[PDB]
Amino acid sequence: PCSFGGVSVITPGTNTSNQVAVLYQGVNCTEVPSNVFQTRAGCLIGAEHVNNSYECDIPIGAGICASYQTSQSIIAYTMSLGAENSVAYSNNSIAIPTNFTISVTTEILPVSMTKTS
Amino acid sequence: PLSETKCTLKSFTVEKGIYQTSNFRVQPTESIVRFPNITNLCPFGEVFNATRFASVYAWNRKRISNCVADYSVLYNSASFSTFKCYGVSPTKLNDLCFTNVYADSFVIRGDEVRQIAPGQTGKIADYNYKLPDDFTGCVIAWNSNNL
Amino acid sequence: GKIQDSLSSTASALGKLQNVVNQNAQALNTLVKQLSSNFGAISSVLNDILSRLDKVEAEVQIDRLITGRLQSLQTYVTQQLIRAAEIRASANLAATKMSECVLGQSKRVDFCGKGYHLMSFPQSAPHGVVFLHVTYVPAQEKNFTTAPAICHDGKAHFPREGVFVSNGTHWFVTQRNFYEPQIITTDNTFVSGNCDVVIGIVNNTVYDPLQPELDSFKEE
Amino acid sequence: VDCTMYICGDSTECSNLLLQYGSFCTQLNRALTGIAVEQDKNTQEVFAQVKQIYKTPPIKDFGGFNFSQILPDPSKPSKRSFIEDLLFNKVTLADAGFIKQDLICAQKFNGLTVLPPLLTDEMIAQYTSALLAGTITSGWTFGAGAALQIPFAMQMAYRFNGIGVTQNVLYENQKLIANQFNSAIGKIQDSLSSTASALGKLQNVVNQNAQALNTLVKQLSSNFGAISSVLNDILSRLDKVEAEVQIDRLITGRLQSLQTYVTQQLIRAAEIRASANLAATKMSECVLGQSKRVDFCGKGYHLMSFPQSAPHGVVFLHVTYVPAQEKNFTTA
Ligand SMILES: *[C@@H]1O[C@H](CO)[C@@H](O[C@@H]2O[C@H](CO)[C@@H](O)[C@H](O)[C@H]2NC(C)=O)[C@H](O)[C@H]1NC(C)=O
Ligand SMILES: *[C@@H]1O[C@H](CO)[C@@H](O[C@@H]2O[C@H](CO)[C@@H](O)[C@H](O)[C@H]2NC(C)=O)[C@H](O)[C@H]1NC(C)=O
Ligand SMILES: *[C@@H]1O[C@H](CO)[C@@H](O[C@@H]2O[C@H](CO)[C@@H](O)[C@H](O)[C@H]2NC(C)=O)[C@H](O)[C@H]1NC(C)=O
Ligand SMILES: *[C@@H]1O[C@H](CO)[C@@H](O[C@@H]2O[C@H](CO)[C@@H](O)[C@H](O)[C@H]2NC(C)=O)[C@H](O)[C@H]1NC(C)=O
Numbered sequence: 001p002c003s004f005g006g007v008s009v010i011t012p013g014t015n016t017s018n019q020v021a022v023l024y025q026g027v028n029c030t031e032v033p034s035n036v037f038q039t040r041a042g043c044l045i046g047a048e049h050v051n052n053s054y055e056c057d058i059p060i061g062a063g064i065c066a067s068y069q070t071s072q073s074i075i076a077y078t079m080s081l082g083a084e085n086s087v088a089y090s091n092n093s094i095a096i097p098t099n100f101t102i103s104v105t106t107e108i109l110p111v112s113m114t115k116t117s
Numbered sequence: 118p119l120s121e122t123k124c125t126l127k128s129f130t131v132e133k134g135i136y137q138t139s140n141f142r143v144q145p146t147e148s149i150v151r152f153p154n155i156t157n158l159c160p161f162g163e164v165f166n167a168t169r170f171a172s173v174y175a176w177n178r179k180r181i182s183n184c185v186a187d188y189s190v191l192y193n194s195a196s197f198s199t200f201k202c203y204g205v206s207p208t209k210l211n212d213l214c215f216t217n218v219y220a221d222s223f224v225i226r227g228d229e230v231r232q233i234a235p236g237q238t239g240k241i242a243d244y245n246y247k248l249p250d251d252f253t254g255c256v257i258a259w260n261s262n263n264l
Numbered sequence: 265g266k267i268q269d270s271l272s273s274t275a276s277a278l279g280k281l282q283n284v285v286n287q288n289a290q291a292l293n294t295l296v297k298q299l300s301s302n303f304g305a306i307s308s309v310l311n312d313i314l315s316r317l318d319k320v321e322a323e324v325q326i327d328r329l330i331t332g333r334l335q336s337l338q339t340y341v342t343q344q345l346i347r348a349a350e351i352r353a354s355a356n357l358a359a360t361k362m363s364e365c366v367l368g369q370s371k372r373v374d375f376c377g378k379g380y381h382l383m384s385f386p387q388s389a390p391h392g393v394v395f396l397h398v399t400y401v402p403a404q405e406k407n408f409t410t411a412p413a414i415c416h417d418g419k420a421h422f423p424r425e426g427v428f429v430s431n432g433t434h435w436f437v438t439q440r441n442f443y444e445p446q447i448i449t450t451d452n453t454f455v456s457g458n459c460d461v462v463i464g465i466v467n468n469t470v471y472d473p474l475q476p477e478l479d480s481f482k483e484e
Numbered sequence: 485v486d487c488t489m490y491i492c493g494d495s496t497e498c499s500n501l502l503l504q505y506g507s508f509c510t511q512l513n514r515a516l517t518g519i520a521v522e523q524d525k526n527t528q529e530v531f532a533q534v535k536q537i538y539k540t541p542p543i544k545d546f547g548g549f550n551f552s553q554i555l556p557d558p559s560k561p562s563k564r565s566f567i568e569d570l571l572f573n574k575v576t577l578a579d580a581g582f583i584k585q586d587l588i589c590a591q592k593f594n595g596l597t598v599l600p601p602l603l604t605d606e607m608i609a610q611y612t613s614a615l616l617a618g619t620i621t622s623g624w625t626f627g628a629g630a631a632l633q634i635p636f637a638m639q640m641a642y643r644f645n646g647i648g649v650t651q652n653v654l655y656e657n658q659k660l661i662a663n664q665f666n667s668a669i670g671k672i673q674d675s676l677s678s679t680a681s682a683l684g685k686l687q688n689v690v691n692q693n694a695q696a697l698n699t700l701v702k703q704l705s706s707n708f709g710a711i712s713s714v715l716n717d718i719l720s721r722l723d724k725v726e727a728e729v730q731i732d733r734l735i736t737g738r739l740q741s742l743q744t745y746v747t748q749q750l751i752r753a754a755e756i757r758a759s760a761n762l763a764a765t766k767m768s769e770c771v772l773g774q775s776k777r778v779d780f781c782g783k784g785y786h787l788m789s790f791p792q793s794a795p796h797g798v799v800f801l802h803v804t805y806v807p808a809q810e811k812n813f814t815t816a
């Protein structure tokens with residue numbers, strides 16, 4: 001059967017911009033034909049691929065995430081896992097906190113849904 | 118695509134994220150037809166217009182194979198008082214290709230032609246000629262009081 | 265105060281709630297939308313079918329309509345049961361958090377907020393509950409040198425509570441989660457075994473509070 | 485799943501009749517997309533516990549304990565560890581959805597496609613390595629706040645103090661204690677190399693993901709009462725007025741099959757959500773700290789735990805203290 005697959009639209013809120021990207025899922029996109037990027041989740045058209053890494057904003061798949069950034073456009077990148085940090089381990093060294101901060105965090109949980117008959 | 122996502126969400130304003138839309142599939146470029154390259158026309162003439170036909174107790178059965186049919190020639194003829202196909206559309210016969218064709222020829226009285234439908238019951242349908250319940254094919258009946 | 269500005273600034277923080285309520289509407293929406301569906305009959309409106317046709321064919325059409333609308337009801341009620349099960353699980357977890365993080369203190373890490381749990385405050389919300397988890401977080405850390413034990417008079421000393429630390433010249437006992445150096449004293453430590461077995465032991469004096477009182481009385 | 489393609493794809497006289505059933509196809513697609521998003525949510529919740537990726541120091545002076553069997557191996561192209569690699573070999577994955585160009589192909593061709601997980605195995609292994617490094621170099625501190633580095637001996641000392649045994653016992657027997665641990669990890673390596681049933685709870689998941697798909701394809705061969713179970717046959721043989729009668733029966737049958745499949749998927753997704761929440765709780769409490777809950781982090785007095793990844797699953801190595809040789813005494 002002819003090549004087929006789902007198509008997804010990557011977009012920021014229309015209240016911010018009108019530019020969109022198109023992700024043909026599971027398609028080796030040599031068949032689709034400067035912004036063509038062959039992901040591991042198909043092919044992405046309409047976004048610029050950069051080597052810089054950020055936190056994932058818009059999930060694309062297979063380690064690729066999109067974002068809207070400056071000149072403004074949609075950028076696809078390999079999502080950064082977090083800040084790099086090497087712990088200064090040694091067999092006779094210790095760290096002790098000399099100061100503290102009391103932080104409040106909000107945790108929100110649904111308790112019930114609307115009764116219906 | 119953006120207006121198409123506006124259509125999919127039934128909203129003028131769309132939030133940030135991914136949105137699955139109507140899938141893409143590449144359309145066929147053209148059409149290829151392949152049939153066996155036999156050429157001889159099938160002798161339906163002696164099948165359907167015999168001088169004489171067999172009786173129901175010994176209903177005649179002619180095998181049809183290795184020939185090019187043309188059911189449109191029959192279907193356009195008005196001599197067919199009754200013509201009913203129970204497993205295929207009569208018009209579509211030109212576009213369908215068969216492994217074989219059994220022509221079962223016999224003669225009855227006028228009232229027993231309802232008995233010849235598949236799944237029917239009656240003296241003819243019970244004691245001399247019964248069609249299968251899952252019968253596929255066509256039934257042809259025509260008056261011969263002048264022949 | 266930072267919460268007050270945060271809830272006044274962002275609207276996505278309450279997503280887990282709206283995702284519930286929206287669905288409660290959305291499923292209802294499609295449960296109405298299936299009424300416009302014909303399901304194969306000649307008309308999707310009941311009064312139309314009734315007016316046009318007589319009983320024997322109206323029955324054929326109304327059976328198809330009934331089958332379609334009954335299947336829609338089956339799908340809707342199964343969706344409702346699954347969502348109700350998820351909400352039951354969420355409500356049981358929330359009740360556990362109310363019973364343990366509010367009416368008491370929890371030793372479970374990260375269960376009542378990211379950090380060392382101090383307390384929590386409950387608040388209501390439309391079809392939901394919001395916990396303000398107040399938690400202690402160590403902030404400014406410093407390096408120190410540590411030994412597993414101290415060898416004073418041929419015997420090993422271990423902290424009753426805390427860690428032996430040194431800034432480079434002197435040794436002290438500090439609690440684990442806040443820096444508060446204190447002189448190595450017999451009250452602060454206990455003795456078990458000699459110094460040959462412990463790997464990495466470091467020589468230092470161990471103060472004995474009875475000795476200066478005894479010496480002062482001797483001078484008296 | 486593409487509802488149109490699955491039911492009777494590549495037919496326009498399909499879409500015309502299928503529109504009569506309303507938004508069932510759209511609802512099914514919405515449910516499947518929700519399940520797909522919930523999978524990513526589960527992975528993010530369980531593995532992305534730390535916002536900072538820690539790395540093990542080049543020096544391995546851990547007081548005699550040997551974590552080489554669970555630390556990452558740079559030789560392998562992936563930073564996957566040794567036991568993690570064993571885990572990846574025990575489970576026989578199917579239809580990973582990495583570029584299709586067989587059962588997997590037969591499932592795919594009928595509109596039944598598999599999206600890839602966002603966090604590929606490499607980022608999962610990186611998360612596991614980060615958590616392991618935090619556990620082995622910072623005690624439980626990194627869970628509560630910043631990374632507070634600490635030598636491993638006094639980390640075990642405070643785990644002993646937590647289990648009600650004085651830390652001195654550790655230091656008077658550390659050489660033996662590590663000798664036990666380095667031995668006990670080895671027993672796992674042989675065990676996972678010997679038995680294949682230990683990972684049943686995982687394969688039972690993956691197998692079902694295939695099996696339901698299998699029967700979801702098998703229903704295509706079903707006729708559901710028509711004269712033929714193939715769409716192109718029906719189309720070729722019959723004219724519009726009777727082809728509509730047959731295609732309505734076929735559509736009803738295939739739509740009911742889709743309803744059953746999507747309900748099964750929703751129930752399995754709910755079970756997986758519960759399992760993933762429990763696993764995230766075990767990651768937050770047994771790894772990033774110490775637990776006073778009996779039997780929650782291993783049979784015995786809990787000392788610590790080490791996380792490891794596995795295909796569509798997580799494996800906790802629960803290290804626990806167990807009293808061994810008892811003696812009688814008289815008490816007042
Ligand atoms: C612990 O941190 C707090 C947080 O700043 C310190 O308090 C600040 O002290 C400075 C310098 O005098 C002031 O300018 C700020 O207004 C204080 N801020 C707050 C939030 O109180 C505190 O001094 C630190 N403790 C130690 C021992 O250094
Ligand atoms: C058998 O004889 C019938 C007589 O009805 C043939 O039908 C006629 O065909 C001629 C030319 O082929 C037409 O001019 C007539 O209009 C036809 N008759 C009617 C009433 O349709 C028929 O062709 C022969 N059958 C076969 C199978 O050869
Ligand atoms: C480590 O801490 C000790 C204790 O505070 C320091 O020793 C003090 O030094 C000051 C300043 O000269 C004196 O007034 C005290 O009498 C000392 N106290 C003690 C207990 O000895 C020591 O200087 C610190 N070392 C470093 C390198 O900072
Ligand atoms: C801690 O004190 C002990 C005892 O004073 C030291 O051990 C002595 O080391 C010297 C010099 O090599 C020897 O001559 C002695 O036989 C040792 N005596 C004992 C009792 O073992 C030890 O070296 C000191 N440790 C540190 C780090 O200064």
Ligand SMILES: *[C@@H]1O[C@H](CO)[C@@H](O[C@@H]2O[C@H](CO)[C@@H](O)[C@H](O)[C@H]2NC(C)=O)[C@H](O)[C@H]1NC(C)=O
Pocket residue numbers: 548550552
């Ligand atoms: C930690 O364990 C590893 C693996 O068991 C040890 O490395 C082995 O060392 C031996 C003896 O020289 C060799 O024969 C092997 O080829 C090594 N295997 C591997 C996988 O490297 C290592 O020595 C142990 N470290 C400690 C401190 O005990």
Ligand SMILES: *[C@@H]1O[C@H](CO)[C@@H](O)[C@H](O)[C@H]1NC(C)=O
Pocket residue numbers: 015
């Ligand atoms: C659209 O964006 C503007 C500027 O960022 C903001 O003020 C406004 O509230 C936004 N509207 C919606 C509906 O999000």
Ligand SMILES: *[C@@H]1O[C@H](CO)[C@@H](O)[C@H](O)[C@H]1NC(C)=O
Pocket residue numbers: 028029030038039583
């Ligand atoms: C697509 O197919 C071509 C030809 O086989 C191959 O060179 C290329 O690597 C493929 N790309 C992907 C993303 O699979």
Ligand SMILES: *[C@@H]1O[C@H](CO)[C@@H](O)[C@H](O)[C@H]1NC(C)=O
Pocket residue numbers: 049050051
């Ligand atoms: C990323 O790095 C590769 C290899 O250095 C290079 O070929 C590519 O052009 C780079 N991409 C960008 C956007 O700089």
Ligand SMILES: *[C@@H]1O[C@H](CO)[C@@H](O)[C@H](O)[C@H]1NC(C)=O
Pocket residue numbers: 088405406407
């Ligand atoms: C502790 O020492 C390490 C290594 O020298 C250094 O990277 C770190 O900044 C130090 N931390 C403090 C609080 O002095």
Ligand SMILES: *[C@@H]1O[C@H](CO)[C@@H](O)[C@H](O)[C@H]1NC(C)=O
Pocket residue numbers: 091092463464545
């Ligand atoms: C710590 O490491 C140093 C350097 O390898 C070594 O000389 C020292 O003996 C070690 N201390 C302990 C207690 O293992």
Ligand SMILES: *[C@@H]1O[C@H](CO)[C@@H](O)[C@H](O)[C@H]1NC(C)=O
Pocket residue numbers: 810811812
């Ligand atoms: C303790 O005493 C009981 C009863 O005499 C005996 O069965 C048991 O073996 C004894 N255990 C030990 C460790 O001596």
